[PDB]
């Protein structure tokens, strides 16, 4: 018998530093019912312990396992079968990108991995690069035939949002969890420690503010400081939610772990949004009016590269994200079965792939689009390119390298949700205040007339969007 | 056998119109199982048909009653143990009314009477009595004493909405709901009309606006008008929404009844709340500055009569919400019950309470508190006497005279929520402007400053009834 031949639909693999509690005992008493097979893994303090399951032994096999404590994780191995509909999925998309990709794609996915995570940013995915489609066309337009754009940038913004969070995630959520199968992920008060954070947050988000503008003067007093400093800046956030972010997570010592990493992720947000939004809307509104304002010469790179700067760091985060054989005698296909266990645990695209962090992308990505559109007309279309490619290196390194989390049957958004109705609004005034200034531009009124029009665009825009909603909703 | 001797658990009134048919051939073939009595009702063409119900006869007599669709109404009829019990508790909440109502007597009545609605109205007007106690005692503490008492209110208000909305409202829907008992009221494309509702709402609104305004200069020009225009407005009002708010909902021709309601009551709030908030708050910006904008003699009456006529509109709301015996030989309590009954089909009084009117009221009360406390220290005070005198004559009314719609045994807020929210929202930033400006009053600064601080109190008093919104649901 070989691990081949076994043809693992399941994997547990437990820590061999109790070898000589030999916890092996444990799982082969309990294997009278069902096969498996015994290999060391990777390193001296791991083995590998692959194990056929089925629906009739569903529960007991890991009632077992939850109490024994020790198992250090739980993988949903893809057998044959289904790593050979996987490939023919791949394959079918891969042919002809240039479509946007359809439901039934999707559908098919979803009833192969049976994945609520993946089917729901996959979904997002789709719905995205569909409805980027009409805006990136009228962006073409707009350009090469030459107030209209701006209205339509405000409406396409906000019948997004509300189409998304209102329409199709519904349904997308009652299909995830109506599957809802064996979550190895899950398996095996906060009033004070959480409003801490917004002061601690801003008080370092207005260093690197601050340390953004000390250094871009850097290179303007000197080509090798621009890489220099968005590298050091990513370094410094890195950094410092380290030694900030993990230690308020771990003293606010919330019961769930699912909720616990929805906060950290919170927290990584603030930062981040306050380090690459409010220097952009900053330096948009201070471009002109700093001028007549006699400052202390003055260029037009101050805000080009400036630009060029803070756009790179976001790529930047997209470039990062995109002797055993021998004692065992494993055959040409066990060794790439036990290759494949080895780059789950260990190899960083073997992991599971982070529904916060992928979303993370995509959000931010959204936010840069509405609310720097009205200045840059092509900007939709350089967006769908990018967001097409993403698509397919996504779609591949989630259905054959990243690490499965639910199991073939059943064994018994949130917060971005949120985020992307903020952006969509603040994307919204921003955009009619570019437009409310820019288009007789250096400022043709005083700042109590801007001011008063972006509060009026505000509320407007607030009540445009509940109107959205309350339509979708009777539906 | 008389009419007490049956002890009617149920009523049920049909159509005599058809004595032709003469349905009460049904209402006996279909009386088999369960003793009933027939007596002629207070007009020639209704009569009343008094029956016995128990759990076990529950479903197949209301089956049939709805296959027959000729019922005209239907009364779960209150016997003699249950009115007992019913003035027994009356009795006892009579005796000293000066404490706050207590949960033990609402759980008593709800255990009673297995209202949802009555139970929920009541549950609210407790609670807004409880939390209403302390601001007035604040502010009779502030007026004997004497931005202190501007932060208070900031804060009891914004404090008093979080918890109604994600404290006790909550709790209290799932209890109603769990009884969720037979509903005689329930039992026997949206955008399109609503929205053109609007217009013809600020049409009208400006309308009665400026017609409240010119009739208080016939009274200066001029005690008589002052009762004549309080009385017309309501009227006109009455008969606005008699020739429009009915119009719309019939064409808009909803399938639910409920909703229909609903919507008429948000129809015929619109134009109350334009009517009774904006001219409010366009005088109370306006009555100072005018004077430097050099009107057109300035005098007090303008302001003082204005907010008395405004004021006395409410209390008048308040104000007015606040042959057949002899041929069938009746008792003494046979007739005291056909009373009963003819009062609950004709008689104003013993029509079903209606949640929204009484919620509606309660809603008003609650807005001008709010957004006239600063000006008026000892509002709180008046308010709370006048809402323990309407409590006691609105849980008098409920339990004794007004329509039971909910059976002892099943047989098988909305909209106003918002309202609150949006009175709460709106009071809060009237108090906070209204104490920036009278401070020191005739204003010290330009119109530019009191808006910017307008909006930013706006925006953070949204930003504190989310934080309070967020530790509530938290729990």
Redesign the interface.
Known sequence: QTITSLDPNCVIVFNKTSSANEKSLNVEFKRLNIHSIIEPGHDLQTSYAFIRIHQDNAKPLFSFLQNLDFIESIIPYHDTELSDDLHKLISISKSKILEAPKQYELYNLSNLTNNPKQSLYFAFLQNYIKWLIPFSFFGLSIRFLSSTYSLFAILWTLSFTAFWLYKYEPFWSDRLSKYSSFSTIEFL???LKKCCFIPVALLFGAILLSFQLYCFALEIFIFLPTILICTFTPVLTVIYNKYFVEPMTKWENHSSVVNAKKSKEAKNFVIIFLSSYVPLLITLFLYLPMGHLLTAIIDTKRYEDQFFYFIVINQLIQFSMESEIGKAQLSSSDMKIWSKVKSYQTDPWGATFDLDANFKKLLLQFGYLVMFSTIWPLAPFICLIVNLIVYQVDLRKAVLYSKPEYFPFPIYVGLWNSVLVMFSILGCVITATLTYMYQSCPINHSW?NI??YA?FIEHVSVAIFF?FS??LK?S
């Open positions: 008060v906060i009033m109590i001011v008063l509060v109107l309350s339509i009777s």
